[PDB]
Amino acid sequence: WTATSGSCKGRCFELQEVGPPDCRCDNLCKSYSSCCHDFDELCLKTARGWECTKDRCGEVRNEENACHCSEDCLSRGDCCTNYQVVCKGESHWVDDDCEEIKVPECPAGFVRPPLIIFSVDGFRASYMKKGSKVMPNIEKLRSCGTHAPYMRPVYPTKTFPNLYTLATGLYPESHGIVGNSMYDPVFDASFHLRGREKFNHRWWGGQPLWITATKQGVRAGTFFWSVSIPHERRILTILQWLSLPDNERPSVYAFYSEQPDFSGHKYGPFGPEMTNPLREIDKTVGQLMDGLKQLRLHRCVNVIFVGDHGMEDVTCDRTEFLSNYLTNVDDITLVPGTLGRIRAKSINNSKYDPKTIIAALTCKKPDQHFKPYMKQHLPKRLHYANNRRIEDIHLLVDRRWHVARKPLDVYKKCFFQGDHGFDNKVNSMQTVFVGYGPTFKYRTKVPPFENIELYNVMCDLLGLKPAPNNGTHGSLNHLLRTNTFRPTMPDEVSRPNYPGIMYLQSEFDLGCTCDDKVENKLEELNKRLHTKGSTKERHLLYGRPAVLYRTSYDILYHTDFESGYSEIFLMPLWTSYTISKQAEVSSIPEHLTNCVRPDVRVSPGFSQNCLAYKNDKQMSYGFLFPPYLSSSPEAKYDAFLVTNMVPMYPAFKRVWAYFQRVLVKKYASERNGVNVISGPIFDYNYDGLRDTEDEIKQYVEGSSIPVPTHYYSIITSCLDFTQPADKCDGPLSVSSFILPHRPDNDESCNSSEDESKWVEELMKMHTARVRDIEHLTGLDFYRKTSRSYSEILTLKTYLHTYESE
Ligand SMILES: *[C@@H]1O[C@H](CO)[C@@H](O[C@@H]2O[C@H](CO)[C@@H](O[C@@H]3O[C@H](CO[C@H]4O[C@H](CO)[C@@H](O)[C@H](O[C@H]5O[C@H](CO)[C@@H](O)[C@H](O)[C@@H]5O[C@H]5O[C@H](CO)[C@@H](O)[C@H](O)[C@@H]5O)[C@@H]4O)[C@@H](O)[C@H](O[C@H]4O[C@H](CO)[C@@H](O)[C@H](O)[C@@H]4O[C@H]4O[C@H](CO)[C@@H](O)[C@H](O)[C@@H]4O)[C@@H]3O)[C@H](O)[C@H]2NC(C)=O)[C@H](O)[C@H]1NC(C)=O
Ligand SMILES: O=C(OCc1ccc(OC(F)(F)F)cc1)N1C[C@@H]2CN(C(=O)c3ccc4[nH]c(=O)oc4n3)C[C@H]2C1
Ligand SMILES: [Ca+2]
Ligand SMILES: [Ca+2]
Ligand SMILES: [Cl-]
Ligand code: NA
Ligand code: NA
Ligand SMILES: [Zn+2]
């Protein structure tokens, strides 16, 4: 019940919300059906429209009008946004030359520059160039302020996950909003776009910017607007709030626009009907900026123009139906559309088997337009697994397509020409970022970045300390004139040992053999120096990685590579090597095919053994430094050390061998040398964080050798590719991957063909940021460069996406 029989007299768009069953006058009361009787009358005035006209100038104040052109309006803070243009001979903001804002020029009483977030739904990144002619206000913001060519949303590229990621800096798996539609098994409840359940606080985790602000004594405007409050009224409300007394005035504000998303669903991303929505968005920006200029706040306020996701061409005749694949289609529930999520219709059914469902959806039709995954097998870059609201079975759907359960669900629900929600690497899903104001830079282009990073910058822009989040604080310092946050490198927790020769061959009983019993005063001083670290400046270009947890490990030096060997996990955490442009690929000699050699620096008891692999019929083994890339026949022996060995499924060895034999050399040619850091990853609980020893679910049969869930590589070179990787004077260039360690290649439908037809495609799919690898290993890379830490942070957040221009 709401006793709706009070009043909004003098309370229009109040900032503090009152407690039921009292009647409300806040910008959300409509969406709760709880506004006072007179709300429409007093708070949503529309009389006479939104603009001043030549004959409204200096009129008698009539309180019934939407906005005012009277003389006293500037003091009351409620003029139509164009009042000065029409009645005082002033110019529109857009028609002024832009001048650098070197310092905040604010009215007395302002303790900090205010922040206005102008967010636009479905604003595809390419609209900035393609609609440039019809968006003059937005185009002035872009070219005078700081801008990116695009900004990467989170997966799934839906509305609520992306808006709440903007507000919190969290992956949807961590903030809880994992889709536009959700079921929570612990709650036994569903979350929909329509309805009242979405208004319950229990869905929304993390700490959004407005709460972070309130708790630290910064006042916030209310971010959410009811759908029936027109755009023009939202702008006037923000402007009115900005006229309040210093003690009452918020410092952070939000505007939301349903366009162009709303139209893009109907007409598609570039439908001719799309020009008008872009014109109107630009008109609304113009109004805000004209309003700010009237109050002399246009060189004081920081404005962020930001989208949640883009928009793709999608029609009904591009729908795949599960009913064309499954027999038992009635025992399942599907969350449909641009992504697929499958669970059992009833948990009282013990005959339901996810394994057989996946099998029935795997490579069944030659042109198939979705791919099924157990959630833990999704590319790690999506960070989409660690939440009870994310179903075990997931369908990644091809751009331009839909997935539905039965055909009946599509025609008894063509209505639409556009949609979104696909993989966040897809070009048509990219969205926009522009920052404009005293704290942003002047006329600056920055590289593309991810939307998880903004929460930190907004906190910076407001002088707040950010709640723990997924951004990397300092990685967007290059956007800002000042207010920068100065990050330090995490302290190393474990220091390494540097073992020498401590064990005799015969102390080892590992069941390993090698054909290496052959025989010089010159060439023996040489091999000693290599094991002491003479070539280490060649293979360890950026310092050794830091270990940021408590453990026991050894640094091992070799002619061609260096590794940090973990005595706990019985394998290296990392292996580092440089492959120059001129280097040569050789093969493994016939006598050395099954050669594994004891490492006399490491005790038998901290070594793997060959017997375990022989006994394990499923598991085989591979090497981290590839024998193929040894610099000499003699150095090749180092590659067969038991300490370079890691466990690998035969099916995965096909992938690994192609990468090591073909691709590394190809990258060295194209990039003028590469440095490579490879290693194992253990993430059995799929939380995206390094597993402790007691979390490993799988060992090589009859031993304490743990099985990695993934294998990573970080491939670095010089951004100026005229300089070789090992003699680089400037910025670096990186690409990385995290390949799932799987006993089959079911993920690749073309895997019965030659590795050259499918391997590289798979690697591209599982591209990663160095930062993703750091979470998963508890390491910290690039500790010794000549670059600034901020720049290195940007590098660590980079993702190579493999999309075209
Ligand atoms: C992205 O950034 C985020 C944020 O920084 C990272 O997530 C953090 O990771 C931490 C490590 O996993 C985690 O710390 C744990 O906190 C537990 C208490 O957490 C509560 O309080 C916080 C802070 O206010 C709050 O945010 C949490 O809210 C969660 O839960 C509610 C509902 O339950 C949700 O509404 C909300 O969305 C959020 O859920 C998300 O996180 C949880 C995990 O906390 C997931 O399960 C969800 O799927 C979802 O993603 C909480 O209300 C605390 O209990 C933990 O402590 C245990 O572990 C430590 C290890 O040191 C041990 O010493 C303790 O003894 C304790 O173990 C005991 O409990 C065990 C389990 O019951 C039991 O096995 C043992 O026997 C012990 O009894 C732990 O410290 C932190 O909560 C989250 N924060 C957030 C916001 O998600 C994330 O890692 C980043 N991602 C990447 C890739 O880097
Ligand atoms: O006022 C709203 O949001 C303010 C807001 C602004 C910025 C924020 O973040 C930042 F400031 F920190 F940056 C956070 C919040 N709302 C009301 C709208 C109801 N919606 C749909 O119903 C919808 C809209 C488009 C859709 N497309 C689709 O497929 O489903 C959709 N549902 C979308 C909701 C957004
Ligand atoms: Ca949207
Ligand atoms: Ca883990
Ligand atoms: Cl969804
Ligand atoms: Na085997
Ligand atoms: Na296959
Ligand atoms: Zn939409």
Coordinates of C-alpha atoms in Angstrom, one line a residue, residues 225-661:
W225 CA 14.9 7.9 -14.6
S226 CA 11.3 6.6 -15.1
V227 CA 10.6 6.0 -18.8
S228 CA 7.7 8.5 -19.0
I229 CA 9.8 11.5 -17.8
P230 CA 10.8 13.1 -21.1
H231 CA 14.5 13.9 -22.0
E232 CA 13.9 17.7 -21.8
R233 CA 12.7 17.4 -18.3
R234 CA 15.6 15.3 -17.2
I235 CA 18.1 17.9 -18.4
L236 CA 16.2 20.8 -16.7
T237 CA 16.1 18.8 -13.5
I238 CA 19.9 18.2 -13.5
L239 CA 20.4 21.9 -14.2
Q240 CA 18.1 22.9 -11.3
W241 CA 20.0 20.6 -9.0
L242 CA 23.1 22.4 -10.0
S243 CA 21.6 25.7 -8.9
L244 CA 21.0 24.5 -5.3
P245 CA 23.0 25.9 -2.3
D246 CA 26.5 24.5 -1.7
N247 CA 25.4 22.3 1.2
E248 CA 22.6 20.7 -0.8
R249 CA 24.1 20.4 -4.3
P250 CA 25.2 17.0 -5.7
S251 CA 28.6 16.5 -7.2
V252 CA 27.8 13.6 -9.5
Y253 CA 24.9 13.3 -12.0
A254 CA 23.5 10.9 -14.6
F255 CA 21.5 11.1 -17.7
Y256 CA 20.1 8.1 -19.6
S257 CA 18.8 7.8 -23.2
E258 CA 16.7 4.9 -24.5
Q259 CA 17.9 5.9 -28.0
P260 CA 19.3 4.9 -30.4
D261 CA 18.8 1.3 -29.0
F262 CA 15.0 1.5 -29.1
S263 CA 14.9 2.3 -32.8
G264 CA 17.9 0.1 -33.7
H265 CA 15.9 -3.0 -32.5
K266 CA 13.2 -2.0 -35.1
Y267 CA 15.1 -0.7 -38.0
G268 CA 18.6 -2.2 -37.6
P269 CA 21.8 -0.4 -36.9
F270 CA 21.9 1.7 -40.2
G271 CA 18.3 1.7 -41.2
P272 CA 17.3 5.1 -42.8
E273 CA 15.0 5.6 -39.8
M274 CA 18.1 5.9 -37.6
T275 CA 19.1 9.4 -38.7
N276 CA 16.3 11.0 -36.6
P277 CA 17.2 9.4 -33.3
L278 CA 20.8 10.6 -33.7
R279 CA 19.6 14.1 -34.4
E280 CA 17.5 14.1 -31.2
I281 CA 20.3 12.7 -29.0
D282 CA 22.5 15.5 -30.3
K283 CA 19.8 18.1 -29.6
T284 CA 19.7 16.9 -26.0
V285 CA 23.5 17.3 -25.7
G286 CA 23.2 20.8 -27.1
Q287 CA 20.6 21.6 -24.5
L288 CA 22.7 20.4 -21.6
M289 CA 25.7 22.4 -22.9
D290 CA 23.7 25.5 -23.5
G291 CA 22.3 25.1 -20.0
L292 CA 25.7 24.7 -18.4
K293 CA 26.9 27.8 -20.3
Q294 CA 24.0 29.9 -18.9
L295 CA 25.0 29.0 -15.4
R296 CA 28.7 29.6 -16.3
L297 CA 29.5 25.9 -15.7
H298 CA 30.6 24.9 -19.2
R299 CA 34.3 25.2 -18.3
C300 CA 33.8 23.8 -14.8
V301 CA 32.0 20.5 -15.3
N302 CA 33.5 17.1 -16.5
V303 CA 31.2 15.5 -19.0
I304 CA 31.4 11.8 -19.9
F305 CA 29.6 10.6 -23.1
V306 CA 29.4 6.8 -22.9
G307 CA 27.5 3.9 -24.5
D308 CA 26.6 0.5 -23.0
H309 CA 27.0 -1.7 -26.3
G310 CA 26.5 -1.5 -30.0
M311 CA 23.8 -3.0 -32.4
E312 CA 23.9 -5.7 -35.1
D313 CA 21.7 -6.7 -38.1
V314 CA 19.5 -9.5 -36.9
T315 CA 16.2 -10.9 -38.5
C316 CA 13.8 -13.8 -37.7
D317 CA 14.8 -15.9 -40.7
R318 CA 18.2 -16.1 -39.1
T319 CA 17.1 -18.3 -36.1
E320 CA 18.5 -21.7 -35.1
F321 CA 16.1 -24.0 -33.3
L322 CA 17.1 -26.5 -30.7
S323 CA 14.2 -28.7 -31.8
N324 CA 16.3 -29.5 -34.9
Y325 CA 19.0 -31.0 -32.8
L326 CA 17.4 -32.4 -29.6
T327 CA 14.8 -35.2 -29.0
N328 CA 14.0 -34.3 -25.4
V329 CA 13.4 -30.5 -26.1
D330 CA 10.6 -30.4 -23.5
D331 CA 12.7 -31.3 -20.5
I332 CA 14.9 -28.2 -20.9
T333 CA 14.5 -24.4 -20.3
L334 CA 16.4 -22.1 -22.7
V335 CA 17.3 -18.4 -22.1
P336 CA 17.1 -17.4 -25.8
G337 CA 18.2 -14.8 -28.3
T338 CA 21.8 -13.6 -29.0
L339 CA 23.2 -16.0 -26.4
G340 CA 22.0 -19.4 -25.1
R341 CA 21.7 -20.6 -21.6
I342 CA 20.2 -24.1 -20.9
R343 CA 19.1 -25.8 -17.7
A344 CA 16.7 -28.6 -16.7
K345 CA 13.0 -27.7 -16.7
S346 CA 12.6 -29.7 -13.5
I347 CA 15.3 -30.6 -10.9
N348 CA 13.1 -33.6 -9.9
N349 CA 14.2 -35.3 -13.1
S350 CA 17.3 -37.5 -12.4
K351 CA 17.5 -38.6 -16.0
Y352 CA 18.7 -35.2 -17.2
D353 CA 22.3 -35.3 -18.4
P354 CA 24.2 -32.2 -19.5
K355 CA 26.9 -34.3 -21.2
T356 CA 24.6 -35.8 -23.8
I357 CA 22.9 -32.4 -24.4
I358 CA 26.2 -30.9 -25.4
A359 CA 27.1 -33.8 -27.6
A360 CA 23.8 -33.5 -29.5
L361 CA 24.7 -29.8 -30.1
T362 CA 28.3 -30.3 -31.2
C363 CA 29.2 -29.9 -34.9
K364 CA 25.9 -31.3 -36.1
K365 CA 25.3 -29.1 -39.2
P366 CA 28.1 -27.8 -41.6
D367 CA 26.9 -24.2 -41.4
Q368 CA 26.0 -24.3 -37.6
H369 CA 25.5 -20.8 -36.2
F370 CA 26.1 -21.4 -32.5
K371 CA 28.6 -23.4 -30.4
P372 CA 27.8 -25.1 -27.1
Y373 CA 30.1 -24.9 -24.0
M374 CA 30.3 -26.1 -20.5
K375 CA 30.6 -22.6 -18.9
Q376 CA 34.1 -23.4 -17.5
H377 CA 35.3 -24.0 -21.0
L378 CA 34.3 -20.5 -22.3
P379 CA 37.2 -18.3 -23.4
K380 CA 38.7 -16.9 -20.2
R381 CA 38.5 -13.4 -21.6
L382 CA 34.7 -13.4 -21.2
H383 CA 35.0 -13.9 -17.4
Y384 CA 31.6 -15.6 -17.5
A385 CA 31.3 -18.6 -15.2
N386 CA 31.7 -17.9 -11.5
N387 CA 28.1 -17.2 -10.5
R388 CA 25.2 -19.6 -9.6
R389 CA 23.0 -17.6 -12.0
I390 CA 25.0 -18.6 -15.0
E391 CA 23.8 -22.0 -16.3
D392 CA 26.3 -24.9 -16.7
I393 CA 25.5 -25.1 -20.4
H394 CA 26.1 -22.0 -22.6
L395 CA 25.6 -21.3 -26.3
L396 CA 27.9 -18.7 -28.0
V397 CA 25.8 -17.5 -30.9
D398 CA 27.3 -16.2 -34.2
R399 CA 26.9 -12.5 -34.9
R400 CA 23.8 -11.8 -36.9
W401 CA 21.9 -14.9 -35.5
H402 CA 19.5 -16.0 -32.8
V403 CA 18.8 -19.2 -31.0
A404 CA 15.4 -20.3 -29.8
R405 CA 13.9 -23.5 -28.4
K406 CA 11.0 -24.3 -30.8
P407 CA 9.7 -22.4 -33.8
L408 CA 6.4 -21.7 -31.9
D409 CA 8.4 -19.5 -29.5
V410 CA 9.4 -17.1 -32.4
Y411 CA 6.0 -16.5 -34.1
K412 CA 3.7 -16.9 -31.0
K413 CA 5.7 -14.6 -28.6
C414 CA 9.1 -10.3 -38.3
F415 CA 9.1 -7.8 -35.5
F416 CA 12.8 -6.9 -35.3
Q417 CA 15.8 -5.9 -37.5
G418 CA 18.4 -5.3 -34.8
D419 CA 19.8 -7.0 -31.7
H420 CA 22.8 -7.2 -29.4
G421 CA 24.3 -9.5 -26.8
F422 CA 27.1 -11.3 -28.8
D423 CA 30.7 -11.9 -27.8
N424 CA 32.3 -8.6 -26.7
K425 CA 35.1 -8.8 -29.3
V426 CA 32.6 -8.4 -32.2
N427 CA 33.0 -5.0 -34.0
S428 CA 29.2 -4.3 -34.2
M429 CA 29.0 -4.5 -30.3
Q430 CA 31.7 -1.9 -29.6
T431 CA 30.4 1.3 -28.2
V432 CA 31.7 4.9 -27.5
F433 CA 33.7 7.0 -25.0
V434 CA 34.2 10.7 -24.9
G435 CA 35.5 12.8 -21.9
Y436 CA 35.3 16.5 -21.9
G437 CA 36.2 19.0 -19.2
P438 CA 39.0 20.5 -17.0
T439 CA 40.2 17.1 -15.7
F440 CA 40.3 15.5 -19.2
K441 CA 42.9 16.2 -21.8
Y442 CA 42.6 18.6 -24.7
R443 CA 42.2 17.2 -28.3
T444 CA 43.6 13.8 -27.4
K445 CA 43.0 10.3 -28.9
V446 CA 43.5 7.4 -26.6
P447 CA 43.6 3.7 -27.6
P448 CA 40.5 1.5 -27.1
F449 CA 39.9 0.3 -23.6
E450 CA 37.3 -1.8 -21.7
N451 CA 34.4 -0.4 -19.8
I452 CA 35.4 -2.1 -16.5
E453 CA 38.1 0.6 -16.3
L454 CA 35.8 3.6 -15.9
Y455 CA 34.6 3.2 -12.3
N456 CA 38.2 3.9 -11.2
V457 CA 38.5 7.1 -13.3
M458 CA 35.1 8.4 -12.2
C459 CA 36.2 7.9 -8.6
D460 CA 39.4 9.8 -9.5
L461 CA 37.4 12.6 -11.1
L462 CA 35.5 12.9 -7.8
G463 CA 38.4 12.4 -5.4
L464 CA 37.0 9.1 -4.1
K465 CA 38.6 5.9 -3.1
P466 CA 37.3 3.1 -5.3
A467 CA 35.8 0.0 -3.8
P468 CA 37.6 -3.3 -4.8
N469 CA 36.9 -3.8 -8.5
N470 CA 38.2 -5.4 -11.8
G471 CA 39.7 -2.4 -13.4
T472 CA 43.4 -1.9 -13.1
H473 CA 43.8 1.4 -11.3
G474 CA 46.2 3.7 -13.2
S475 CA 45.8 2.0 -16.6
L476 CA 43.7 5.0 -17.8
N477 CA 45.9 7.7 -16.3
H478 CA 46.7 8.8 -19.9
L479 CA 43.1 10.2 -20.2
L480 CA 43.6 12.8 -17.5
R481 CA 45.2 16.2 -17.3
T482 CA 45.5 15.8 -13.5
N483 CA 43.8 14.0 -10.5
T484 CA 46.0 11.0 -11.4
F485 CA 46.4 8.1 -9.0
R486 CA 50.0 6.9 -8.6
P487 CA 50.2 3.2 -8.5
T488 CA 53.1 1.2 -7.0
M489 CA 54.2 -2.3 -8.1
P490 CA 53.0 -5.1 -5.8
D491 CA 55.8 -6.3 -3.5
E492 CA 57.3 -9.7 -4.3
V493 CA 56.2 -12.2 -1.6
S494 CA 58.4 -15.2 -2.4
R495 CA 62.1 -14.9 -3.4
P496 CA 63.7 -17.7 -5.4
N497 CA 66.5 -20.2 -4.8
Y498 CA 69.4 -20.5 -7.2
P499 CA 70.3 -24.2 -7.0
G500 CA 73.6 -25.5 -8.4
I501 CA 74.7 -29.1 -9.1
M502 CA 73.7 -31.0 -6.0
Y503 CA 72.7 -34.5 -7.2
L504 CA 74.2 -37.4 -9.0
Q505 CA 72.5 -39.1 -11.9
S506 CA 72.1 -42.4 -10.0
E507 CA 70.1 -40.8 -7.2
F508 CA 67.2 -40.5 -9.7
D509 CA 64.8 -43.3 -10.2
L510 CA 62.3 -41.7 -12.5
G511 CA 62.0 -44.4 -15.1
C512 CA 63.3 -42.0 -17.8
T513 CA 65.8 -42.9 -20.5
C514 CA 67.9 -40.8 -22.9
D515 CA 70.4 -41.5 -25.7
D516 CA 72.9 -38.9 -24.4
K517 CA 76.0 -40.8 -23.3
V518 CA 78.7 -39.0 -25.5
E519 CA 81.6 -36.6 -24.8
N520 CA 87.0 -30.1 -24.2
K521 CA 88.5 -27.3 -22.0
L522 CA 87.1 -24.4 -24.2
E523 CA 83.5 -25.5 -24.6
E524 CA 83.1 -26.6 -20.9
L525 CA 83.8 -23.2 -19.3
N526 CA 81.2 -22.0 -21.8
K527 CA 78.4 -24.3 -20.6
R528 CA 79.1 -23.4 -17.0
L529 CA 78.5 -19.7 -17.7
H530 CA 75.2 -20.5 -19.4
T531 CA 74.0 -22.4 -16.3
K532 CA 75.1 -19.4 -14.1
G533 CA 73.1 -17.0 -16.3
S534 CA 75.4 -15.5 -19.0
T535 CA 72.7 -15.4 -21.7
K536 CA 70.0 -14.3 -19.3
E537 CA 69.9 -10.7 -20.6
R538 CA 68.8 -12.3 -24.0
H539 CA 66.0 -14.4 -22.7
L540 CA 64.7 -12.4 -19.8
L541 CA 64.1 -9.0 -21.4
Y542 CA 61.8 -7.4 -18.8
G543 CA 63.1 -8.8 -15.5
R544 CA 61.9 -12.0 -13.9
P545 CA 58.2 -12.2 -13.0
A546 CA 57.5 -11.6 -9.3
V547 CA 55.8 -14.3 -7.3
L548 CA 53.0 -12.7 -5.2
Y549 CA 52.1 -15.6 -3.0
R550 CA 54.0 -17.8 -0.4
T551 CA 55.7 -20.7 -2.2
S552 CA 59.0 -22.5 -2.9
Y553 CA 60.7 -22.2 -6.2
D554 CA 63.9 -22.2 -8.2
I555 CA 65.3 -20.1 -11.0
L556 CA 66.9 -22.3 -13.6
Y557 CA 69.2 -20.9 -16.3
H558 CA 70.0 -22.5 -19.7
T559 CA 71.6 -21.5 -23.0
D560 CA 68.3 -20.8 -24.8
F561 CA 65.8 -20.3 -21.9
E562 CA 65.2 -19.5 -18.3
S563 CA 62.5 -20.8 -15.9
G564 CA 61.1 -20.4 -12.4
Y565 CA 60.6 -24.0 -11.3
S566 CA 57.9 -24.7 -8.6
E567 CA 58.9 -27.3 -6.0
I568 CA 55.2 -27.5 -5.0
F569 CA 53.6 -28.1 -8.4
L570 CA 56.6 -30.1 -9.8
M571 CA 56.8 -27.9 -13.0
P572 CA 57.7 -24.4 -14.0
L573 CA 55.4 -21.5 -13.2
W574 CA 56.9 -19.7 -16.1
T575 CA 59.5 -20.2 -18.9
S576 CA 61.1 -17.2 -20.7
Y577 CA 62.9 -17.3 -24.1
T578 CA 63.7 -15.0 -27.0
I579 CA 63.4 -16.0 -30.7
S580 CA 65.1 -13.6 -33.1
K581 CA 64.0 -13.0 -36.7
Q582 CA 66.9 -15.0 -38.1
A583 CA 66.6 -18.0 -35.9
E584 CA 66.1 -21.5 -37.3
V585 CA 63.6 -24.3 -36.8
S586 CA 65.1 -27.8 -36.6
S587 CA 63.5 -31.1 -35.9
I588 CA 63.9 -33.5 -33.0
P589 CA 66.5 -36.2 -33.9
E590 CA 65.3 -39.8 -34.1
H591 CA 67.4 -41.0 -31.1
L592 CA 66.0 -38.3 -28.9
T593 CA 62.2 -38.8 -29.5
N594 CA 61.5 -40.2 -26.0
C595 CA 64.4 -38.6 -24.2
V596 CA 63.8 -37.2 -20.7
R597 CA 66.9 -36.3 -18.6
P598 CA 67.2 -35.8 -14.8
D599 CA 68.0 -32.3 -13.7
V600 CA 71.0 -32.4 -11.3
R601 CA 70.0 -29.1 -9.7
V602 CA 66.6 -30.4 -8.5
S603 CA 66.1 -33.3 -6.0
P604 CA 64.3 -36.5 -7.2
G605 CA 61.6 -35.8 -4.7
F606 CA 60.7 -32.5 -6.3
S607 CA 60.8 -33.9 -9.9
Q608 CA 58.2 -35.5 -12.1
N609 CA 58.7 -39.1 -13.2
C610 CA 58.3 -40.9 -16.6
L611 CA 56.6 -43.9 -15.0
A612 CA 53.5 -42.0 -14.1
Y613 CA 53.0 -41.0 -17.8
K614 CA 53.5 -44.5 -19.0
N615 CA 50.9 -45.8 -16.5
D616 CA 48.5 -42.9 -17.3
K617 CA 46.8 -44.1 -20.5
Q618 CA 45.0 -40.7 -21.0
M619 CA 47.9 -38.4 -20.2
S620 CA 51.0 -37.7 -22.2
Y621 CA 53.6 -34.9 -21.8
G622 CA 55.1 -31.9 -23.6
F623 CA 57.8 -29.2 -23.1
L624 CA 57.5 -25.5 -22.3
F625 CA 60.7 -24.4 -24.1
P626 CA 60.2 -26.1 -27.5
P627 CA 63.1 -28.5 -28.6
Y628 CA 62.4 -27.4 -32.2
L629 CA 63.9 -23.9 -31.5
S630 CA 67.2 -24.9 -29.8
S631 CA 70.1 -22.8 -31.0
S632 CA 72.5 -25.8 -31.4
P633 CA 72.5 -29.6 -31.3
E634 CA 74.2 -29.4 -27.9
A635 CA 71.8 -26.9 -26.4
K636 CA 68.9 -29.1 -27.5
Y637 CA 69.7 -31.5 -24.6
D638 CA 68.6 -28.8 -22.1
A639 CA 65.1 -28.9 -23.6
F640 CA 64.6 -32.5 -22.5
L641 CA 65.3 -31.9 -18.8
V642 CA 62.5 -33.3 -16.6
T643 CA 62.2 -29.8 -15.3
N644 CA 61.0 -28.4 -18.7
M645 CA 58.3 -31.1 -18.8
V646 CA 54.5 -30.5 -18.3
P647 CA 51.5 -32.8 -18.6
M648 CA 49.5 -32.8 -21.9
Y649 CA 46.6 -34.7 -23.4
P650 CA 47.5 -36.2 -26.8
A651 CA 44.6 -34.1 -28.3
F652 CA 46.1 -30.9 -26.8
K653 CA 49.6 -31.9 -28.0
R654 CA 48.4 -31.4 -31.6
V655 CA 47.7 -27.7 -30.7
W656 CA 50.8 -27.2 -28.7
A657 CA 53.2 -28.7 -31.3
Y658 CA 51.8 -26.5 -34.1
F659 CA 52.1 -23.4 -32.0
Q660 CA 55.8 -24.3 -31.1
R661 CA 56.9 -25.7 -34.5

